[PDB]
Motif scaffolding. Structure first.
Motif, PDB file in Angstrom:
ATOM      1  N   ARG A   1     -14.474 -13.447  20.491  1.00  0.00           N
ATOM      2  CA  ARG A   1     -15.747 -13.634  21.196  1.00  0.00           C
ATOM      3  C   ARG A   1     -15.881 -12.665  22.374  1.00  0.00           C
ATOM      4  O   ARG A   1     -14.922 -12.455  23.129  1.00  0.00           O
ATOM      5  N   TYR A   2     -17.078 -12.094  22.521  1.00  0.00           N
ATOM      6  CA  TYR A   2     -17.419 -11.229  23.653  1.00  0.00           C
ATOM      7  C   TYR A   2     -18.858 -11.519  24.059  1.00  0.00           C
ATOM      8  O   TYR A   2     -19.772 -11.342  23.252  1.00  0.00           O
ATOM      9  N   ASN A   3     -19.052 -11.950  25.305  1.00  0.00           N
ATOM     10  CA  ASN A   3     -20.345 -12.467  25.777  1.00  0.00           C
ATOM     11  C   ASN A   3     -20.940 -13.495  24.810  1.00  0.00           C
ATOM     12  O   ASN A   3     -22.106 -13.388  24.411  1.00  0.00           O
ATOM     13  N   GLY A   4     -20.132 -14.480  24.422  1.00  0.00           N
ATOM     14  CA  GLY A   4     -20.598 -15.566  23.556  1.00  0.00           C
ATOM     15  C   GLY A   4     -20.658 -15.251  22.068  1.00  0.00           C
ATOM     16  O   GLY A   4     -20.526 -16.160  21.244  1.00  0.00           O
ATOM     17  N   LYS A   5     -20.843 -13.973  21.722  1.00  0.00           N
ATOM     18  CA  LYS A   5     -21.081 -13.541  20.337  1.00  0.00           C
ATOM     19  C   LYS A   5     -19.773 -13.331  19.595  1.00  0.00           C
ATOM     20  O   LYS A   5     -18.843 -12.728  20.146  1.00  0.00           O
ATOM     21  N   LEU A   6     -19.698 -13.817  18.354  1.00  0.00           N
ATOM     22  CA  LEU A   6     -18.529 -13.555  17.499  1.00  0.00           C
ATOM     23  C   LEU A   6     -18.591 -12.113  17.011  1.00  0.00           C
ATOM     24  O   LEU A   6     -19.588 -11.693  16.441  1.00  0.00           O
ATOM     25  N   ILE A   7     -17.525 -11.360  17.221  1.00  0.00           N
ATOM     26  CA  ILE A   7     -17.529  -9.917  16.926  1.00  0.00           C
ATOM     27  C   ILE A   7     -16.497  -9.462  15.866  1.00  0.00           C
ATOM     28  O   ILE A   7     -16.360  -8.273  15.605  1.00  0.00           O
ATOM     29  N   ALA A   8     -15.763 -10.407  15.278  1.00  0.00           N
ATOM     30  CA  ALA A   8     -14.808 -10.106  14.203  1.00  0.00           C
ATOM     31  C   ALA A   8     -14.202 -11.374  13.594  1.00  0.00           C
ATOM     32  O   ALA A   8     -14.284 -12.476  14.169  1.00  0.00           O
ATOM     33  N   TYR A   9     -13.579 -11.185  12.432  1.00  0.00           N
ATOM     34  CA  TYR A   9     -12.846 -12.239  11.726  1.00  0.00           C
ATOM     35  C   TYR A   9     -11.370 -12.304  12.164  1.00  0.00           C
ATOM     36  O   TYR A   9     -10.672 -11.276  12.229  1.00  0.00           O
ATOM     37  N   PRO A  10     -10.897 -13.513  12.499  1.00  0.00           N
ATOM     38  CA  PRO A  10      -9.455 -13.727  12.641  1.00  0.00           C
ATOM     39  C   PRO A  10      -8.687 -13.657  11.307  1.00  0.00           C
ATOM     40  O   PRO A  10      -9.185 -14.104  10.263  1.00  0.00           O
ATOM     41  N   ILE A  11      -7.482 -13.085  11.364  1.00  0.00           N
ATOM     42  CA  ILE A  11      -6.629 -12.920  10.183  1.00  0.00           C
ATOM     43  C   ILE A  11      -5.215 -13.471  10.383  1.00  0.00           C
ATOM     44  O   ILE A  11      -4.663 -14.111   9.488  1.00  0.00           O
ATOM     45  N   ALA A  12      -4.614 -13.204  11.531  1.00  0.00           N
ATOM     46  CA  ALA A  12      -3.209 -13.569  11.734  1.00  0.00           C
ATOM     47  C   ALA A  12      -2.920 -13.852  13.213  1.00  0.00           C
ATOM     48  O   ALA A  12      -3.584 -13.347  14.113  1.00  0.00           O
ATOM     49  N   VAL A  13      -1.895 -14.647  13.452  1.00  0.00           N
ATOM     50  CA  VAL A  13      -1.639 -15.150  14.770  1.00  0.00           C
ATOM     51  C   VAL A  13      -0.190 -14.908  15.078  1.00  0.00           C
ATOM     52  O   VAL A  13       0.689 -15.182  14.264  1.00  0.00           O
ATOM     53  N   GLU A  14       0.043 -14.383  16.266  1.00  0.00           N
ATOM     54  CA  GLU A  14       1.358 -13.927  16.692  1.00  0.00           C
ATOM     55  C   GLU A  14       1.605 -14.425  18.104  1.00  0.00           C
ATOM     56  O   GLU A  14       0.732 -14.314  18.981  1.00  0.00           O
ATOM     57  N   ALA A  15       2.796 -14.955  18.331  1.00  0.00           N
ATOM     58  CA  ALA A  15       3.178 -15.426  19.647  1.00  0.00           C
ATOM     59  C   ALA A  15       4.690 -15.356  19.756  1.00  0.00           C
ATOM     60  O   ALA A  15       5.398 -15.282  18.748  1.00  0.00           O
ATOM     61  N   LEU A  16       5.198 -15.358  20.979  1.00  0.00           N
ATOM     62  CA  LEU A  16       6.646 -15.435  21.171  1.00  0.00           C
ATOM     63  C   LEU A  16       7.087 -16.849  20.767  1.00  0.00           C
ATOM     64  O   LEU A  16       6.322 -17.831  20.910  1.00  0.00           O
ATOM     65  N   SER A  17       8.306 -16.932  20.244  1.00  0.00           N
ATOM     66  CA  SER A  17       8.942 -18.193  19.899  1.00  0.00           C
ATOM     67  C   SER A  17      10.365 -18.165  20.454  1.00  0.00           C
ATOM     68  O   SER A  17      10.879 -17.099  20.883  1.00  0.00           O
ATOM     69  N   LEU A  18      10.984 -19.343  20.484  1.00  0.00           N
ATOM     70  CA  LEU A  18      12.364 -19.467  20.940  1.00  0.00           C
ATOM     71  C   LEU A  18      13.241 -19.343  19.733  1.00  0.00           C
ATOM     72  O   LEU A  18      13.056 -20.098  18.743  1.00  0.00           O
ATOM     73  N   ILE A  19      14.189 -18.399  19.832  1.00  0.00           N
ATOM     74  CA  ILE A  19      15.119 -18.143  18.768  1.00  0.00           C
ATOM     75  C   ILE A  19      16.532 -18.478  19.229  1.00  0.00           C
ATOM     76  O   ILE A  19      16.912 -18.141  20.330  1.00  0.00           O
ATOM     77  N   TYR A  20      17.306 -19.143  18.376  1.00  0.00           N
ATOM     78  CA  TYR A  20      18.611 -19.641  18.749  1.00  0.00           C
ATOM     79  C   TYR A  20      19.587 -19.634  17.624  1.00  0.00           C
ATOM     80  O   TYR A  20      19.235 -19.773  16.458  1.00  0.00           O
ATOM     81  N   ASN A  21      20.840 -19.511  18.045  1.00  0.00           N
ATOM     82  CA  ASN A  21      21.979 -19.380  17.177  1.00  0.00           C
ATOM     83  C   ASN A  21      22.626 -20.746  16.975  1.00  0.00           C
ATOM     84  O   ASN A  21      23.103 -21.384  17.917  1.00  0.00           O
ATOM     85  N   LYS A  22      22.658 -21.195  15.732  1.00  0.00           N
ATOM     86  CA  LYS A  22      23.003 -22.588  15.457  1.00  0.00           C
ATOM     87  C   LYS A  22      24.514 -22.779  15.485  1.00  0.00           C
ATOM     88  O   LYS A  22      24.993 -23.857  15.827  1.00  0.00           O
ATOM     89  N   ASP A  23      25.258 -21.720  15.164  1.00  0.00           N
ATOM     90  CA  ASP A  23      26.735 -21.745  15.275  1.00  0.00           C
ATOM     91  C   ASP A  23      27.240 -21.689  16.714  1.00  0.00           C
ATOM     92  O   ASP A  23      28.441 -21.853  16.944  1.00  0.00           O
ATOM     93  N   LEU A  24      26.348 -21.412  17.668  1.00  0.00           N
ATOM     94  CA  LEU A  24      26.661 -21.525  19.097  1.00  0.00           C
ATOM     95  C   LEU A  24      25.894 -22.636  19.766  1.00  0.00           C
ATOM     96  O   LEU A  24      26.257 -23.061  20.862  1.00  0.00           O
ATOM     97  N   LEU A  25      24.821 -23.083  19.118  1.00  0.00           N
ATOM     98  CA  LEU A  25      23.929 -24.048  19.702  1.00  0.00           C
ATOM     99  C   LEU A  25      23.131 -24.578  18.575  1.00  0.00           C
ATOM    100  O   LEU A  25      22.092 -24.022  18.251  1.00  0.00           O
ATOM    101  N   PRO A  26      23.616 -25.659  17.956  1.00  0.00           N
ATOM    102  CA  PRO A  26      22.961 -26.237  16.789  1.00  0.00           C
ATOM    103  C   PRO A  26      21.678 -26.944  17.167  1.00  0.00           C
ATOM    104  O   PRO A  26      20.745 -27.031  16.367  1.00  0.00           O
ATOM    105  N   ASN A  27      21.638 -27.450  18.390  1.00  0.00           N
ATOM    106  CA  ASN A  27      20.497 -28.169  18.874  1.00  0.00           C
ATOM    107  C   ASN A  27      19.926 -27.395  20.050  1.00  0.00           C
ATOM    108  O   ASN A  27      20.546 -27.335  21.112  1.00  0.00           O
ATOM    109  N   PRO A  28      18.752 -26.777  19.861  1.00  0.00           N
ATOM    110  CA  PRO A  28      18.137 -26.039  20.951  1.00  0.00           C
ATOM    111  C   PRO A  28      17.481 -26.967  21.976  1.00  0.00           C
ATOM    112  O   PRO A  28      16.906 -27.989  21.603  1.00  0.00           O
TER     113      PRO A  28
END
Lengths: 454, 454, 454, 454
Positions: D95-122
């Motif tokens: 959205r730009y000034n209220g108006k839809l200006i393109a189609y969404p396709i994919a979503v990307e964000a940081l996530s928490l990544i962890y090693n289960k052999d050092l920390l099985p429960n994050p």
């Protein structure tokens, strides 16, 4: 037209000045109106440039070189008799390219301020302050605390032995000559930094910290201006105000600022202003009237200054001003403040040696304009680089056109090669035919002569 | 207006055509003037675009797509009865965006040329030429020599199995579809290159070298066009002209070019030209007249072609034209020639493998405009980058202005701090004074009640 | 078709010209309309090429080379009776490939301008200027100031001793014979650098500065055109205008620009245009009407130049012009401005020596033909552009850092100010409480002596 | 005109997208080409603005606010039947000034990544990390490591407790409403600084270091996006991907990036581009084709996200999306990355406190980095400009090469033609010699039967 409107700031004695206006109104019939509108220094260049606003404006002399640069101020013409009524050095604060552009009124300058009870004989020399502090520290006091964050307050010591902002020669500032890393300024600054190193002062000491410390009697001495007196008054410390300490023999050199009255280039009443300033305000009567409403501090008018000097504090201020450096009225001085401010803080906080701190002022004080210079070279480089793009554009239309001619020419030439080659042999065999016929005619004639001769 | 002026090149039968003009002049009273001015193909777009020049122009069909692109030619309207008088495929040489824009006249195309005495039964397949050459080399002759420097001559074999210049679908060319590195073209070129590798041909053989060799009877076959006949005539080699050999089963695919008569969009005599071409020139009588002055070679007019076919050379030409590829009339075809030219030379000289040579054609075909496209993007990038330079310019003026405010504000605030602080305590002690006075009033009242109550 | 449209720039006297066109509309009956479309030099090639736009076009002659080369301009055919009415050399600036392409109208050249009250007898040689600057610096003024940035201004000195742009041979220039690092130019440029070396001039003196300097009487001399006069007229400096000094006994060689009037190649009114110029404008009465609207400066018409030259300024401009260099009307010249603009700065600021700075000029000038070269010269330009955008970037980053530090102080004080106000205003309400309290307690006591008891 | 060209960055699954265009080309008949031009985001504003370039463009949604503001994008009009197929908040990033200006396709964000052999429960909260780092340091391992240099990474924690860049209101941003030193930000940065103080992290941990650490099992956890997974796959650490931990009971606020599909403002194919996205790409099959070439990560389409979310990792990224901050698509956002980048360094290394560092970020929007931004956008533009000039230079060099070869033929031919003209002309005169020699001999013989004899 026919009357004078004058602008002065609200923290001055405008009523006092109006009184002088009324004396003028009586004597010539000209009504004088005095005003103190909101942020009038910003308002001035906007109203003068359309024949409006005040016929005369009172302000700090430094804003005036900016106004003269925009030809906004009238050139003033006071005969030398009148020029000798004020202190020589004050006129230097009201020149721009050799033209006098305003009348000096007041003079302001830092002075040494000290607690009489803690220290009845303030020192004359920076050099003795360390030892003095070691003494007072042994009874829970400090010798000196003043605002180190700002250059206006640290300059006096730095400039003492040799520094200067911009060289001044003939009523003119050479904006490329900056005396901030000359051996003198280096000595000034080293000392100051050393005071911090030897724990006689704190590098993080600013205005409010200094003021508080002096007012509570925690420090013997501080450095500050007449703007500060009515404040210190009401601490009821018993305080002396006097000459700044010398350094390496030389006077401290505090910057000096000068309340000046200037006349509008636009105004029609140029000679009625000249009158009002020269013969009504810049007199003992006139200044006294403004003084009653709100003290001016040390003044430019020798005769009346000599009266005010009874107040030794006002004596000190002017003594210091006369040993100080008029504050240059040129746009570039704000680059100076900016640069020098950062220079000193860095020098003080350990972030830089004095030497590197001061050497960078030379670079940094112009980082503003060198960058602006690169933006404008680049502006031109794009005009050029846009031209070359036209050239390439036609370079490509050319090459595309001359490819077609080559492709077509290849074939034209092939056809021509066959045409002229067939045309060749055809003409040849025609000619070669005529030859055999003539060969046969000559053979037949020759055969006859042999018959006939025999 | 009221008469027809016609432009034809000088290497055509213009007198022959004038005769047709006179037959027309007699029958309708309209005087027809025929001209052959110097480089008229270049001259045409300049005179038509100011309502001048010829009412009709005879030229190679390929120049005409360029003229139609500039809307210079009238759209022609021949009823289908007339359309079936000429060969279908000829009409495809005179379309632009589905609009028919000229009348086809003559058809030209390469054919196989061979020495009857050295080789009375020319081969039908490229595949048998190596062997043939090994045979003739054993008696100091070569099988085949033709112009390899140019693509117009090498294409026929390359395109044979699958190549094409630009895809053609609906009277329209997809200028992005180029069939020059499809598996078919790769086979064609490989073969050609292999011939050179196996020393049956020389890579450095051009038009003049081929022509000389064939005319001196050093080579059994060559490839060339009608433009070349009258030249070979006068070598008096006994030469046959016939179908190009096939490759991998498929016919060779030589490019085909079509002499075409087009009508000026500007001309007022559009229907008198339509007439002249349809009913006087494109008939057996009319073409025959032109043919007498200068042979047209194979013609578009079925009926008269069928006559000329008695000359088996003219039969071959058309047989080869019908198996060939009309030469696209679009501006971009000159990029094709340029690209494909270099492709083949490189392929043949060893400088590149077939695969890399042909793969690059795809890139190089558009070097041309891809490069021009970069110049114009860059043109826009500079407009943007100039705008940003304005922005930086005011960014610097801003920063310089807001440094002055900051420097002045530092001090304004210091004064204010002292003002409002002194004003502070002065109001406080006033109030604190009222307090003691009230404290004393209340004390005095309270001291009275105790007296009075007691 | 029986009407004359004329283009002439806005800053010319077009209402004047309009008057000449009415005196023409009267005596024949052909309407003449004058216009002054924006960017009309760049509009002309687009409008002329579609049969549109003006019959006659007035402009600085150098643009007319571009037009002629595109064949946009008609060849004027004036008799030698007419030709002799104009000054011989005004024809040299309207030639392209031998052919006369336009009518000269006005003539323009830098001239040496001076303040008589500061210098009543101007110098006749460059060589005496240093000696003269010393004399003047003694009383805080400068000898000479004029735009050093732009070559157009510096050239006069440089080319003086036998230097030139491109050799003028007959009616054209040999594009590869150049007088930029022959004996003359080196010597001259050496002198210009010496003046800057010996502090007589500043390296970064531009137009805007040099105008203000002279026009406010800071400097004895400037160098400038007729365009710069009316601005002096209003400043009221008592100025004179004269021959530029000699260098090595030779006259200074300033560029000459000659306002020419050209005629559209395919204009319907061929003889009618010639007629207007030859018999109506280029006569004392026509030129006067124009001149009365806006001063043309020196004019090419002998008869009227002798009238105007009664004005010693107009006479001076024409002298310098006859002693100066016509601006080559050839495309190649636009590298000159750039090559020499940087050559000047590089030799001045010392980034190059004089010999090597003029050798790089020598090269970039000679010759074109550009196309792909243009593109590589862009490639290097953009490395330079990058360097500058870098410099601007670190310029901002430095100011930003130092601006950050003044803001540190400013918020600190603003903080303390806001704190002080808070503390004070609370203290005041605390007391005003004490007062309202006491006022009540006293009211009770008081109201209970008055009642209970007396 | 009846064809669809698409731009999509190279590291995306473009061969997959091509598969979607062939399924589209089949069912309609409109050819669809996918390209991946280098630096295409910067390219698009220059190609859109000359009616060239792509019908649809694929990129991170932030770049699209720039484009929308220049009007370069078409407003998309999908029915609410379609809108509902996509996750509500994906439409907030387009959205730009209220108006839809393109189609969404994919979503990307940081996530928490962890090693289960050092920390099985994050862990579920930031606050437990110090406690957990102590435990881990004990056995020579660190709890957490991730890019501290870059704010994009450090933001998640800082913004956690109610922080934000600019307030999103309806369909725009209040450019002057900023959450950078609200209550939330300070608390978060403060925690990030504390972690560094207490030796739980290193101040100078960048991306490269953090990856290698986690990937070689030296740290239990890292913070990172999908892009880093395949590198871990290979290292073979046994790793889980999960929600980022809460701060003060608030979900971390990492920046969400939505890959979006925009349509050119003046694209001839308006309804056709919509038709391709709505009915072919944004559907299980379409997205599958693309995901099979290169993983897209989270997808905006509900129907296919629930499929891909069977991969816990993908569900995890989607969860941290929903709980995260959509990148503001406004120009002002580039100040942010800078201001904050320094803020974090300064607060980390101790050169400022958390309060004063975040106040300086607060200010730098707007003020001084108007200009500095424009300088830096100039700086990147010249990189595009240099690629363009590159492309032109090898454009010329290519055609130059191919021009050279065509000339080769042309000169060879002209040579042969000139040789043939010479050869023949020497023949024709040779014969004409004989003919006039024979005539004379005949004339003699003949003249000497007639006379001598009969």
């Amino acid at each position: 037209e026919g009357k004078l409107v004058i602008w002065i700031n609200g923290d001055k004695g405008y009523n006092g000045l109006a009184e002088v206006g009324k004396k003028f109104e009586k004597d010539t019939g000209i009504k004088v109106t005095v005003e103190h509108p909101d942020k009038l220094e910003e308002k001035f260049p906007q109203v003068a440039a359309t024949g409006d606003g005040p016929d005369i404006i009172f302000w700090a002399h430094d804003r005036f070189g900016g106004y003269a640069q925009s030809g906004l101020l009238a050139e003033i013409t006071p005969d030398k008799a009148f020029q000798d009524k004020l202190y020589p050095f004050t006129w230097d604060a009201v020149r721009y390219n050799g033209k006098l552009i305003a009348y000096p009124i007041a003079v302001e300058a830092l002075s040494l301020i000290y607690n009489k009870d803690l220290l009845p004989n303030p020192p004359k020399t920076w050099e003795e302050i360390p030892a003095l502090d070691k003494e007072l520290k042994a009874k829970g006091k400090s010798a000196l605390m003043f605002n180190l964050q700002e250059p206006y307050f640290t300059w006096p010591l730095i400039a003492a032995d040799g520094g200067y902002a911009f060289k001044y020669e003939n009523g003119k500032y050479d904006i490329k000559d900056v005396g901030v890393d000359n051996a003198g300024a280096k000595a000034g600054l080293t000392f100051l930094v050393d005071l911090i190193k030897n724990k006689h002062m704190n590098a993080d000491t600013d205005y409010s910290i200094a003021e508080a410390a002096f007012n509570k009697g925690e420090t013997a001495m501080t450095i500050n201006g007449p703007w500060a007196w009515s404040n210190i008054d009401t601490s009821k410390v018993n305080y002396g105000v006097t000459v700044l300490p010398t350094f390496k023999g030389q006077p401290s050199k505090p910057f000096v600022g000068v309340l000046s009255a200037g006349i509008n280039a636009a105004s029609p009443n140029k000679e009625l202003a000249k009158e009002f300033l020269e013969n009504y305000l810049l007199t003992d009567e006139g200044l006294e009237a403004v003084n009653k409403d709100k003290p001016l501090g040390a003044v430019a008018l020798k005769s009346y200054e000599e009266e005010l000097a009874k107040d030794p504090r006002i004596a000190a201020t002017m003594e210091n001003a006369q040993k100080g450096e008029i504050m240059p009225n040129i746009p570039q001085m704000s680059a100076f403040w900016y640069a020098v401010r950062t220079a000193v803080i860095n020098a003080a906080s350990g972030r830089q040696t004095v030497d590197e701190a001061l050497k960078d002022a030379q670079t940094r004080i112009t980082a503003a304009r060198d960058g602006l210079r690169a933006v404008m070279e680049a502006r031109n480089v794009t005009h050029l680089l846009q031209q070359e793009l036209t050239e390439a554009q036609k370079g490509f239309q050319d090459v595309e056109a001359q490819a077609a001619t080559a492709n077509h020419t290849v074939m034209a030439l092939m056809a021509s090669l066959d045409a002229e080659k067939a045309q060749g042999q055809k003409k040849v065999e025609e000619l070669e035919g005529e030859i055999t016929t003539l060969n046969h005619k000559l053979q037949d004639a020759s055969a006859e002569v042999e018959r006939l001769r025999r």
